[PDB]
Design an enzyme around this catalytic site. Structure first.
Site, PDB file in Angstrom:
ATOM      1  N   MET A  73     110.704  15.271 112.928  1.00 33.46           N
ATOM      2  CA  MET A  73     109.845  16.454 112.172  1.00 33.46           C
ATOM      3  C   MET A  73     109.745  16.283 110.847  1.00 33.46           C
ATOM      4  O   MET A  73     108.896  17.361 110.211  1.00 33.46           O
ATOM      5  CB  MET A  73     110.428  17.784 112.902  1.00 33.46           C
ATOM      6  CG  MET A  73     110.704  17.728 114.272  1.00 33.46           C
ATOM      7  SD  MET A  73     110.879  19.491 115.021  1.00 33.46           S
ATOM      8  CE  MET A  73     109.016  19.454 115.310  1.00 33.46           C
TER       9      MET A  73
ATOM     10  N   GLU B 237     112.678  15.623 106.916  1.00 29.46           N
ATOM     11  CA  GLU B 237     113.627  15.656 106.245  1.00 29.46           C
ATOM     12  C   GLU B 237     113.775  16.320 104.878  1.00 29.46           C
ATOM     13  O   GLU B 237     112.684  16.409 104.290  1.00 29.46           O
ATOM     14  CB  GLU B 237     114.350  14.253 105.987  1.00 29.46           C
ATOM     15  CG  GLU B 237     115.584  14.107 105.421  1.00 29.46           C
ATOM     16  CD  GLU B 237     116.053  12.582 105.027  1.00 29.46           C
ATOM     17  OE1 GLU B 237     115.502  11.589 105.250  1.00 29.46           O
ATOM     18  OE2 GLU B 237     117.293  12.326 104.906  1.00 29.46           O
TER      19      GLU B 237
ATOM     20  N   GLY C   6     116.891  19.413 103.503  1.00 28.14           N
ATOM     21  CA  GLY C   6     118.344  19.883 102.768  1.00 28.14           C
ATOM     22  C   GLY C   6     119.353  19.161 103.604  1.00 28.14           C
ATOM     23  O   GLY C   6     120.324  19.472 104.267  1.00 28.14           O
TER      24      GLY C   6
ATOM     25  N   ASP D 128     116.264  26.589  97.506  1.00 30.96           N
ATOM     26  CA  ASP D 128     115.392  25.883  97.944  1.00 30.96           C
ATOM     27  C   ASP D 128     114.024  26.591  98.444  1.00 30.96           C
ATOM     28  O   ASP D 128     113.586  26.138  99.553  1.00 30.96           O
ATOM     29  CB  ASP D 128     115.581  24.687  98.761  1.00 30.96           C
ATOM     30  CG  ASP D 128     114.901  23.294  98.467  1.00 30.96           C
ATOM     31  OD1 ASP D 128     114.236  23.225  97.513  1.00 30.96           O
ATOM     32  OD2 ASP D 128     115.228  22.377  99.278  1.00 30.96           O
TER      33      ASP D 128
ATOM     34  N   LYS E 219     110.529  27.193  99.026  1.00 28.09           N
ATOM     35  CA  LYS E 219     109.245  26.289  98.805  1.00 28.09           C
ATOM     36  C   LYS E 219     108.388  26.542 100.152  1.00 28.09           C
ATOM     37  O   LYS E 219     109.007  26.860 101.133  1.00 28.09           O
ATOM     38  CB  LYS E 219     109.672  24.827  98.547  1.00 28.09           C
ATOM     39  CG  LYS E 219     110.468  24.115  99.511  1.00 28.09           C
ATOM     40  CD  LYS E 219     110.535  22.659  98.856  1.00 28.09           C
ATOM     41  CE  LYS E 219     111.514  22.112  99.914  1.00 28.09           C
ATOM     42  NZ  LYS E 219     111.678  20.584  99.497  1.00 28.09           N
TER      43      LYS E 219
ATOM     44  N   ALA F 182     107.393  24.049 102.177  1.00 32.08           N
ATOM     45  CA  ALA F 182     107.945  23.219 103.211  1.00 32.08           C
ATOM     46  C   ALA F 182     109.069  23.960 103.972  1.00 32.08           C
ATOM     47  O   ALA F 182     109.327  23.504 105.352  1.00 32.08           O
ATOM     48  CB  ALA F 182     108.251  21.731 102.820  1.00 32.08           C
TER      49      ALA F 182
ATOM     50  N   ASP G 212     116.197  26.288 106.191  1.00 29.84           N
ATOM     51  CA  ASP G 212     116.926  25.279 105.468  1.00 29.84           C
ATOM     52  C   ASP G 212     117.998  26.317 104.362  1.00 29.84           C
ATOM     53  O   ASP G 212     117.510  26.565 103.504  1.00 29.84           O
ATOM     54  CB  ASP G 212     116.295  24.312 104.562  1.00 29.84           C
ATOM     55  CG  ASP G 212     116.879  22.809 104.764  1.00 29.84           C
ATOM     56  OD1 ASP G 212     118.094  22.883 104.734  1.00 29.84           O
ATOM     57  OD2 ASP G 212     116.334  21.999 105.099  1.00 29.84           O
TER      58      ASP G 212
HETATM   59  C1  LIG Z   1     104.673  20.319 114.026  1.00 34.40           C
HETATM   60  C2  LIG Z   1     105.332  21.230 114.408  1.00 34.40           C
HETATM   61  C3  LIG Z   1     106.797  21.565 113.245  1.00 34.40           C
HETATM   62  N1  LIG Z   1     107.730  22.453 113.981  1.00 34.40           N
HETATM   63  C4  LIG Z   1     108.967  22.575 113.376  1.00 34.40           C
HETATM   64  N2  LIG Z   1     109.666  23.837 114.135  1.00 34.40           N
HETATM   65  C5  LIG Z   1     111.018  23.956 113.320  1.00 34.40           C
HETATM   66  C6  LIG Z   1     111.439  23.175 112.390  1.00 34.40           C
HETATM   67  C7  LIG Z   1     112.693  23.444 111.689  1.00 34.40           C
HETATM   68  N3  LIG Z   1     113.118  22.907 110.534  1.00 34.40           N
HETATM   69  C8  LIG Z   1     114.460  23.763 110.202  1.00 34.40           C
HETATM   70  C9  LIG Z   1     115.247  23.022 108.848  1.00 34.40           C
HETATM   71  C10 LIG Z   1     116.462  23.932 108.551  1.00 34.40           C
HETATM   72  C11 LIG Z   1     116.551  25.011 109.278  1.00 34.40           C
HETATM   73  C12 LIG Z   1     116.095  25.385 110.485  1.00 34.40           C
HETATM   74  C13 LIG Z   1     114.823  24.632 110.667  1.00 34.40           C
HETATM   75  S1  LIG Z   1     113.563  24.902 112.231  1.00 34.40           S
HETATM   76  C14 LIG Z   1     110.375  22.081 111.652  1.00 34.40           C
HETATM   77  N4  LIG Z   1     110.728  21.450 110.612  1.00 34.40           N
HETATM   78  C15 LIG Z   1     109.929  20.363 109.994  1.00 34.40           C
HETATM   79  C16 LIG Z   1     110.664  19.472 109.023  1.00 34.40           C
HETATM   80  C17 LIG Z   1     110.512  20.300 107.569  1.00 34.40           C
HETATM   81  C18 LIG Z   1     111.857  20.802 106.979  1.00 34.40           C
HETATM   82  O1  LIG Z   1     113.137  19.715 106.964  1.00 34.40           O
HETATM   83  C19 LIG Z   1     109.560  21.350 107.737  1.00 34.40           C
HETATM   84  O2  LIG Z   1     108.551  21.374 106.413  1.00 34.40           O
HETATM   85  C20 LIG Z   1     108.826  21.202 109.025  1.00 34.40           C
HETATM   86  O3  LIG Z   1     107.653  20.419 109.001  1.00 34.40           O
HETATM   87  N5  LIG Z   1     109.316  21.977 112.312  1.00 34.40           N
END
Ligand SMILES: CCCNc1ncc(-c2nc3ccccc3s2)c(N[C@@H]2C[C@H](CO)[C@@H](O)[C@H]2O)n1
Length: 283
Positions: free
Chosen positions: A28, A30, A32, A142, A144, A146, A160
Protein backbone atom coordinates in the site's frame (compact mmCIF):
# COMPACT_ATOMS: atom_id res chain seq x y z
CA UNK A 1 -5.50 -4.37 21.47
CA UNK A 2 -5.81 -7.79 19.69
CA UNK A 3 -2.62 -9.91 19.62
CA UNK A 4 -2.07 -11.42 16.18
CA UNK A 5 0.37 -14.12 15.09
CA UNK A 6 3.11 -13.00 12.63
CA UNK A 7 2.13 -15.95 10.39
CA UNK A 8 -1.60 -15.01 10.57
CA UNK A 9 -0.63 -11.58 9.13
CA UNK A 10 1.98 -13.15 6.75
CA UNK A 11 -0.86 -15.38 5.36
CA UNK A 12 -3.42 -12.52 4.90
CA UNK A 13 -0.75 -10.28 3.22
CA UNK A 14 0.54 -13.15 0.92
CA UNK A 15 4.06 -13.48 2.52
CA UNK A 16 4.32 -9.61 2.57
CA UNK A 17 3.98 -8.85 -1.20
CA UNK A 18 5.88 -5.63 -2.22
CA UNK A 19 3.77 -5.13 -5.42
CA UNK A 20 0.85 -2.63 -5.97
CA UNK A 21 -2.88 -3.58 -5.62
CA UNK A 22 -3.46 -2.55 -9.30
CA UNK A 23 -1.12 -5.32 -10.66
CA UNK A 24 -1.79 -8.19 -8.17
CA UNK A 25 0.26 -7.47 -4.98
CA UNK A 26 -0.39 -6.42 -1.34
CA UNK A 27 1.86 -3.30 -0.78
CA UNK A 28 0.00 0.00 0.00
CA UNK A 29 3.10 2.24 0.42
CA UNK A 30 5.93 3.20 2.82
CA UNK A 31 6.36 6.19 5.16
CA UNK A 32 7.08 6.36 8.95
CA UNK A 33 9.75 3.56 8.99
CA UNK A 34 7.41 0.70 8.00
CA UNK A 35 5.74 -0.74 4.86
CA UNK A 36 1.90 -0.82 4.62
CA UNK A 37 0.36 -4.10 3.28
CA UNK A 38 -3.28 -4.90 2.41
CA UNK A 39 -4.77 -7.96 4.22
CA UNK A 40 -8.09 -9.61 5.22
CA UNK A 41 -8.63 -10.79 8.84
CA UNK A 42 -11.78 -11.52 11.00
CA UNK A 43 -14.09 -10.97 7.94
CA UNK A 44 -12.62 -7.41 7.42
CA UNK A 45 -10.02 -5.76 5.09
CA UNK A 46 -7.05 -4.42 7.11
CA UNK A 47 -3.85 -2.31 6.78
CA UNK A 48 -0.69 -4.09 8.02
CA UNK A 49 2.34 -2.00 9.01
CA UNK A 50 5.39 -4.30 9.03
CA UNK A 51 8.24 -2.55 10.90
CA UNK A 52 11.38 -3.85 9.09
CA UNK A 53 19.00 0.77 13.64
CA UNK A 54 17.71 -2.62 15.02
CA UNK A 55 16.68 -0.97 18.39
CA UNK A 56 15.49 2.33 16.71
CA UNK A 57 13.04 0.24 14.56
CA UNK A 58 11.64 -1.33 17.82
CA UNK A 59 11.11 2.14 19.44
CA UNK A 60 8.91 3.12 16.39
CA UNK A 61 6.60 0.13 17.31
CA UNK A 62 6.40 0.72 21.13
CA UNK A 63 5.60 4.46 20.57
CA UNK A 64 2.60 3.82 18.20
CA UNK A 65 1.04 1.27 20.64
CA UNK A 66 1.50 3.56 23.72
CA UNK A 67 0.08 6.63 21.89
CA UNK A 68 -2.91 4.65 20.41
CA UNK A 69 -3.63 2.79 23.74
CA UNK A 70 -4.43 6.33 25.01
CA UNK A 71 -5.57 7.68 21.53
CA UNK A 72 -9.12 6.62 20.45
CA UNK A 73 -10.82 9.18 18.13
CA UNK A 74 -13.09 9.34 15.04
CA UNK A 75 -10.43 11.35 13.12
CA UNK A 76 -7.51 8.97 13.77
CA UNK A 77 -6.90 5.60 12.10
CA UNK A 78 -8.06 2.81 14.43
CA UNK A 79 -5.40 0.33 15.61
CA UNK A 80 -7.15 -3.06 15.67
CA UNK A 81 -4.20 -5.19 16.83
CA UNK A 82 -0.47 -6.01 16.53
CA UNK A 83 2.21 -8.74 16.29
CA UNK A 84 5.53 -9.15 18.19
CA UNK A 85 6.05 -13.00 18.06
CA UNK A 86 7.79 -12.93 14.62
CA UNK A 87 11.12 -11.37 13.50
CA UNK A 88 9.44 -8.18 12.15
CA UNK A 89 7.06 -6.09 14.31
CA UNK A 90 3.52 -5.50 12.90
CA UNK A 91 0.59 -3.06 13.43
CA UNK A 92 -3.01 -3.78 12.30
CA UNK A 93 -5.44 -0.99 11.31
CA UNK A 94 -8.92 -0.55 9.80
CA UNK A 95 -8.47 -0.41 5.97
CA UNK A 96 -9.20 3.09 4.58
CA UNK A 97 -11.11 2.40 1.28
CA UNK A 98 -10.51 5.88 -0.17
CA UNK A 99 -6.73 5.89 0.60
CA UNK A 100 -4.90 9.22 1.23
CA UNK A 101 -5.89 12.87 0.79
CA UNK A 102 -2.72 13.19 -1.42
CA UNK A 103 -3.94 10.46 -3.84
CA UNK A 104 -7.47 11.89 -3.88
CA UNK A 105 -6.23 15.40 -4.54
CA UNK A 106 -4.14 14.00 -7.44
CA UNK A 107 -7.09 11.72 -8.65
CA UNK A 108 -4.70 8.76 -8.59
CA UNK A 109 -6.03 5.71 -10.48
CA UNK A 110 -8.89 7.67 -12.10
CA UNK A 111 -10.89 8.54 -8.98
CA UNK A 112 -13.21 11.61 -9.29
CA UNK A 113 -11.95 15.03 -8.04
CA UNK A 114 -13.10 15.84 -4.48
CA UNK A 115 -15.73 18.63 -4.31
CA UNK A 116 -15.21 21.74 -2.15
CA UNK A 117 -17.98 20.44 0.20
CA UNK A 118 -15.99 17.16 0.81
CA UNK A 119 -12.69 19.20 1.08
CA UNK A 120 -14.22 21.43 3.88
CA UNK A 121 -15.43 18.34 5.78
CA UNK A 122 -11.90 16.77 5.40
CA UNK A 123 -10.12 19.95 6.67
CA UNK A 124 -12.50 20.12 9.72
CA UNK A 125 -12.08 16.37 10.39
CA UNK A 126 -8.25 16.53 10.09
CA UNK A 127 -8.12 19.56 12.53
CA UNK A 128 -10.31 17.57 15.03
CA UNK A 129 -7.79 14.67 14.83
CA UNK A 130 -4.78 17.04 15.47
CA UNK A 131 -6.72 18.68 18.36
CA UNK A 132 -7.27 15.27 19.99
CA UNK A 133 -3.49 14.55 19.71
CA UNK A 134 -2.52 18.00 21.10
CA UNK A 135 -5.13 17.80 23.96
CA UNK A 136 -3.50 14.48 24.96
CA UNK A 137 -0.03 16.18 24.79
CA UNK A 138 1.22 14.47 21.58
CA UNK A 139 3.11 15.97 18.62
CA UNK A 140 2.56 14.19 15.29
CA UNK A 141 5.81 15.44 13.57
CA UNK A 142 4.64 14.31 10.07
CA UNK A 143 1.32 16.11 9.28
CA UNK A 144 0.94 15.83 5.48
CA UNK A 145 -1.70 14.83 2.87
CA UNK A 146 -0.28 11.29 2.50
CA UNK A 147 -0.89 10.89 6.32
CA UNK A 148 -4.56 11.94 6.14
CA UNK A 149 -6.66 8.92 5.28
CA UNK A 150 -10.21 8.70 4.07
CA UNK A 151 -12.83 6.11 5.06
CA UNK A 152 -16.05 4.80 3.36
CA UNK A 153 -17.68 8.22 4.03
CA UNK A 154 -14.56 10.35 3.22
CA UNK A 155 -14.07 11.08 6.96
CA UNK A 156 -10.51 12.33 7.55
CA UNK A 157 -8.38 9.94 9.65
CA UNK A 158 -4.84 11.02 10.78
CA UNK A 159 -2.34 8.09 10.38
CA UNK A 160 1.38 7.33 11.12
CA UNK A 161 2.48 7.90 14.76
CA UNK A 162 5.97 6.27 14.41
CA UNK A 163 7.63 9.73 14.78
CA UNK A 164 5.13 10.91 17.50
CA UNK A 165 6.51 12.62 20.68
CA UNK A 166 10.24 23.06 23.50
CA UNK A 167 12.80 20.22 23.05
CA UNK A 168 15.73 19.99 20.56
CA UNK A 169 16.97 16.93 18.59
CA UNK A 170 19.93 15.74 16.49
CA UNK A 171 17.74 13.23 14.49
CA UNK A 172 15.71 15.68 12.28
CA UNK A 173 12.65 13.81 10.95
CA UNK A 174 9.54 14.70 8.89
CA UNK A 175 8.76 15.76 5.30
CA UNK A 176 10.77 18.77 4.08
CA UNK A 177 8.01 20.36 1.92
CA UNK A 178 5.63 20.39 4.93
CA UNK A 179 8.18 21.23 7.68
CA UNK A 180 8.16 24.42 9.82
CA UNK A 181 11.49 26.41 9.89
CA UNK A 182 12.10 25.44 13.58
CA UNK A 183 11.36 21.69 13.01
CA UNK A 184 13.96 21.81 10.18
CA UNK A 185 16.44 23.18 12.82
CA UNK A 186 15.71 20.30 15.29
CA UNK A 187 12.98 21.82 17.52
CA UNK A 188 10.08 19.63 18.78
CA UNK A 189 6.83 21.62 19.32
CA UNK A 190 3.07 21.11 18.52
CA UNK A 191 3.43 24.52 16.75
CA UNK A 192 5.27 22.64 13.95
CA UNK A 193 2.08 20.47 13.41
CA UNK A 194 0.01 23.70 12.84
CA UNK A 195 2.48 24.88 10.12
CA UNK A 196 2.33 21.46 8.34
CA UNK A 197 -1.50 21.61 8.50
CA UNK A 198 -1.31 25.05 6.74
CA UNK A 199 0.55 23.33 3.82
CA UNK A 200 -2.26 20.63 3.75
CA UNK A 201 -4.94 23.40 3.56
CA UNK A 202 -2.99 24.94 0.63
CA UNK A 203 -3.02 21.45 -1.08
CA UNK A 204 -6.81 21.20 -0.44
CA UNK A 205 -7.49 24.66 -2.01
CA UNK A 206 -5.14 24.30 -5.03
CA UNK A 207 -5.09 20.56 -5.67
CA UNK A 208 -1.26 20.99 -6.12
CA UNK A 209 1.29 18.70 -4.29
CA UNK A 210 3.52 20.42 -1.59
CA UNK A 211 6.53 19.65 -3.77
CA UNK A 212 6.59 19.24 -7.57
CA UNK A 213 10.08 19.00 -9.14
CA UNK A 214 8.80 20.13 -12.61
CA UNK A 215 6.83 23.13 -11.25
CA UNK A 216 7.74 26.78 -10.79
CA UNK A 217 7.84 27.26 -7.82
CA UNK A 218 8.74 23.68 -6.77
CA UNK A 219 7.42 24.26 -3.20
CA UNK A 220 3.74 25.10 -2.57
CA UNK A 221 4.56 27.16 0.57
CA UNK A 222 6.35 29.64 -1.79
CA UNK A 223 3.01 30.22 -3.66
CA UNK A 224 1.79 31.84 -0.38
CA UNK A 225 4.59 34.43 -0.84
CA UNK A 226 3.55 35.14 -4.50
CA UNK A 227 -0.02 35.84 -3.29
CA UNK A 228 1.16 38.11 -0.35
CA UNK A 229 3.33 40.15 -2.80
CA UNK A 230 0.12 40.62 -4.94
CA UNK A 231 1.45 39.32 -8.25
CA UNK A 232 -1.48 36.79 -7.99
CA UNK A 233 -4.48 36.00 -5.69
CA UNK A 234 -5.77 32.74 -4.09
CA UNK A 235 -8.55 32.73 -6.78
CA UNK A 236 -5.87 32.20 -9.48
CA UNK A 237 -4.66 29.10 -7.56
CA UNK A 238 -8.09 27.45 -6.75
CA UNK A 239 -8.28 23.86 -8.00
CA UNK A 240 -10.10 23.89 -11.41
CA UNK A 241 -11.27 20.27 -10.86
CA UNK A 242 -14.19 21.67 -8.71
CA UNK A 243 -17.62 23.08 -9.62
CA UNK A 244 -18.93 23.85 -6.03
CA UNK A 245 -16.28 26.24 -4.64
CA UNK A 246 -17.22 29.80 -3.64
CA UNK A 247 -14.80 32.75 -3.07
CA UNK A 248 -15.98 33.36 0.51
CA UNK A 249 -15.28 29.87 1.92
CA UNK A 250 -12.07 29.48 -0.21
CA UNK A 251 -10.71 32.85 1.09
CA UNK A 252 -11.76 31.84 4.64
CA UNK A 253 -9.79 28.54 4.33
CA UNK A 254 -6.81 30.44 2.82
CA UNK A 255 -6.79 32.91 5.79
CA UNK A 256 -6.59 29.92 8.21
CA UNK A 257 -3.68 28.44 6.11
CA UNK A 258 -1.90 31.88 6.08
CA UNK A 259 -2.15 32.12 9.90
CA UNK A 260 -0.89 28.50 10.16
CA UNK A 261 2.02 29.42 7.86
CA UNK A 262 3.53 32.24 10.06
CA UNK A 263 7.30 31.57 10.01
CA UNK A 264 7.36 32.72 13.69
CA UNK A 265 6.05 29.68 15.67
CA UNK A 266 4.54 31.89 18.43
CA UNK A 267 2.45 33.97 15.95
CA UNK A 268 0.61 30.80 14.66
CA UNK A 269 -2.81 29.91 16.15
CA UNK A 270 -3.23 26.82 18.35
CA UNK A 271 -5.29 23.84 17.07
CA UNK A 272 -8.47 24.92 18.97
CA UNK A 273 -8.41 28.30 17.15
CA UNK A 274 -7.85 26.45 13.82
CA UNK A 275 -11.02 24.30 14.48
CA UNK A 276 -13.08 27.41 15.44
CA UNK A 277 -12.02 29.22 12.23
CA UNK A 278 -12.72 26.14 10.03
CA UNK A 279 -16.16 25.70 11.71
CA UNK A 280 -17.08 29.42 11.11
CA UNK A 281 -16.15 28.89 7.40
CA UNK A 282 -19.09 26.38 6.95
CA UNK A 283 -21.59 28.25 9.23
C1 LIG B 1 -5.97 2.25 -2.10
C2 LIG B 1 -6.53 2.05 -0.69
C3 LIG B 1 -5.54 2.52 0.39
N1 LIG B 1 -5.99 2.22 1.77
C4 LIG B 1 -5.25 2.37 2.95
N2 LIG B 1 -5.84 2.08 4.13
C5 LIG B 1 -5.10 2.23 5.28
C6 LIG B 1 -3.71 2.63 5.26
C7 LIG B 1 -2.93 2.88 6.49
N3 LIG B 1 -1.67 3.36 6.54
C8 LIG B 1 -1.27 3.60 7.85
C9 LIG B 1 0.03 4.07 8.30
C10 LIG B 1 0.29 4.26 9.69
C11 LIG B 1 -0.76 4.04 10.64
C12 LIG B 1 -2.04 3.59 10.18
C13 LIG B 1 -2.27 3.37 8.82
S1 LIG B 1 -3.73 2.80 8.07
C14 LIG B 1 -3.20 2.96 3.94
N4 LIG B 1 -1.91 3.40 3.71
C15 LIG B 1 -1.28 3.81 2.43
C16 LIG B 1 0.26 3.92 2.50
C17 LIG B 1 0.58 5.40 2.89
C18 LIG B 1 1.06 5.50 4.39
O1 LIG B 1 2.33 4.86 4.54
C19 LIG B 1 -0.74 6.20 2.65
O2 LIG B 1 -0.52 7.44 2.00
C20 LIG B 1 -1.75 5.22 1.96
O3 LIG B 1 -1.71 5.33 0.52
N5 LIG B 1 -3.99 2.79 2.82
Amino acid sequence: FHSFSFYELKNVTNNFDERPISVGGNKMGEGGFGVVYKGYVNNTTVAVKKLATTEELKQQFDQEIKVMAKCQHENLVELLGFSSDGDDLCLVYVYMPNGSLLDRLSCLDGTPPLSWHMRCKIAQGAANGINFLHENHHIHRDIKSANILLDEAFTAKISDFGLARTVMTSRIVGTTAYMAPEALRGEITPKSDIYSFGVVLLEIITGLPAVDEHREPQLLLDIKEEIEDEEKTIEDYIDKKMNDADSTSVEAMYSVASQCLHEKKNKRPDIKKVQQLLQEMTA
